[PDB]
């Protein structure tokens, strides 16, 4: 299938409680493989998946150095951001970063990403062209001007088209037994009377990977989008994910309802109904 590598970085200031904490977590698809936390007693790039453990000492200490420097960079960014928005030194603020690359089944670059949010709001993003920026406001325009002057986009493009794609391909090869294995959902439909007049049908999907899934209910073949309660896809803790969708149905009308499941691990999509 297609695959992604993404780093998710969070830097958060905490006036009166030391310097801003920096945490970076790296993923291939829905599998975390590294973490770095400046609050760790001994901050270092640490493995969080078995297939990365085979990388030698040079991998770990080179990445550790990048992340230690990134901690300082993000602190610089937070200081600058506070100024751009004329903010007090009393408050806590958050800078988030997402960067990395997507590749197709053949390992070719689909696109790169490098974007930032300040206090939960999009701030600046590298455009899909990997050459230009989109700034959200006049503060981000200051960053944009600075990054244009320093030709930052050219450095990011080189990273995203080269290093990122090269390492993603390497990770996919080393972890092929897991990263390139889609585990289909185990499914069932439960039935819960709520009154004499109505009952809940709940369609379950358990044990699937990756997280992307489509779970829908139909009544007489029509999608019940508005009337379906759909919980957020949630991690089980064993790499897999879970999800359910529920509809309230009139008593006696259960067989008019079908649950439909689409997932990469399924040979064919599923159509389930309540099986009393």
């Amino acid at each position: 299938g297609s695959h992604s590598m993404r780093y998710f970085d969070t830097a958060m200031s905490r006036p009166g409680r030391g310097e801003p904490r920096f945490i970076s977590v790296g993923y291939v698809d829905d599998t975390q493989f590294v973490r770095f936390d400046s609050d760790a007693a001994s901050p270092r790039e640490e493995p969080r998946a078995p297939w990365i453990e085979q990388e030698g000492p040079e991998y770990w200490d080179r990445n550790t150095q990048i992340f230690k420097t990134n901690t300082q960079t993000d602190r610089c960014s937070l200081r600058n951001l506070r100024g751009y928005y004329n903010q007090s030194e009393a408050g806590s603020h958050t800078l988030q970063s997402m960067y990395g690359c997507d590749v197709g089944p053949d390992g070719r670059l689909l696109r790169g990403h490098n974007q930032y949010a300040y206090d939960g709001k999009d701030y600046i993003a590298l455009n899909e062209d990997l050459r230009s920026w989109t700034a959200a406001d006049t503060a981000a325009q200051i960053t944009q001007r600075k990054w244009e002057a320093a030709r930052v986009a050219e450095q990011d493009r080189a990273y995203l088209e080269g290093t990122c794609v090269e390492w993603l391909r390497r990770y996919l090869e080393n972890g092929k037994d897991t990263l390139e294995r889609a585990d289909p959902p185990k499914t069932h439909v439960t039935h819960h009377p709520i009154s004499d007049h109505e009952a809940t049908l709940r369609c379950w999907a358990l044990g699937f990977y990756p997280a992307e899934i489509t779970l829908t209910w139909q009544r007489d073949g029509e999608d019940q989008t508005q009337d379906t309660e759909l919980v957020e896809t949630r991690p089980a803790g064993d790499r897999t994910f879970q999800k359910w969708a529920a509809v309230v149905v009139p008593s006696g009308e259960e067989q008019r309802y079908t649950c439909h499941v689409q997932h990469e691990g399924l040979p064919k999509p599923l159509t389930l109904r309540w099986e009393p």
Binding site: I66, T73, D74, L81, S97, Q155, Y159
Partner: peptide
């Protein structure tokens, strides 16, 4: 290295 060098905003 695998991780990306970041730039100050």
């Amino acid at each position: 290295a695998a991780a990306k060098k970041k730039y100050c905003l």
